[PDB]
Amino acid sequence: GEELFTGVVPILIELDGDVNGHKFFVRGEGEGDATIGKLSLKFIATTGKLPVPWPTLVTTLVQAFSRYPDHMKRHDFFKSAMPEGYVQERTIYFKDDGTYKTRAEVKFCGDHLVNRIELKGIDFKEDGNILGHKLEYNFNSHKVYITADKQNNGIKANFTIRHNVEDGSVQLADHYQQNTPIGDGPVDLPDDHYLSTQTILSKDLNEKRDHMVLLEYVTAAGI
């Protein structure tokens, strides 16, 4: 379980997307180090220019790499579901705009962790901040609130992402999340806690394809 995360783990990410009928595919690679709670990844849109801004996809595009400090180990659901993995599902409500629905499988393939995601988005406004590409290329820090869902032998989470808009306003995205283990056996159901997240988005200046370089630090807290 946790024993699979004592060192650096290579990551492959795939996202098959469809927002208001605009189809796209994103592929990411890099590495995660759960001992420090660090993720370094590069994402490419293989279908050309995205119909939505990169920041809207960040939350979707491996919380198993969160640093859980020693006293909180017993509360790390994400690692305890490995290698078989977990399903992660979300509904994301963009305030005054459309919604994303996502379903992902996060599991080991041999020595590498893979996150495979399907995303469907509906009811977005033409000129809105999302389809109008009015969101800044950056990301804020958040708290991801996690609670046990004993019925499903898993967890739920709730949080609101704050996306900065070009005109100086903020676009809120309310996230509702569920995770359930894929394989049989026991998993760790946690007491209430949160993950504190920080993310930096950048560009590779030699990369001509549409892309996003990401560095994140996440540490669990609240117990």
Ligand SMILES: [Zn+2]
């Ligand atoms: Zn693989």
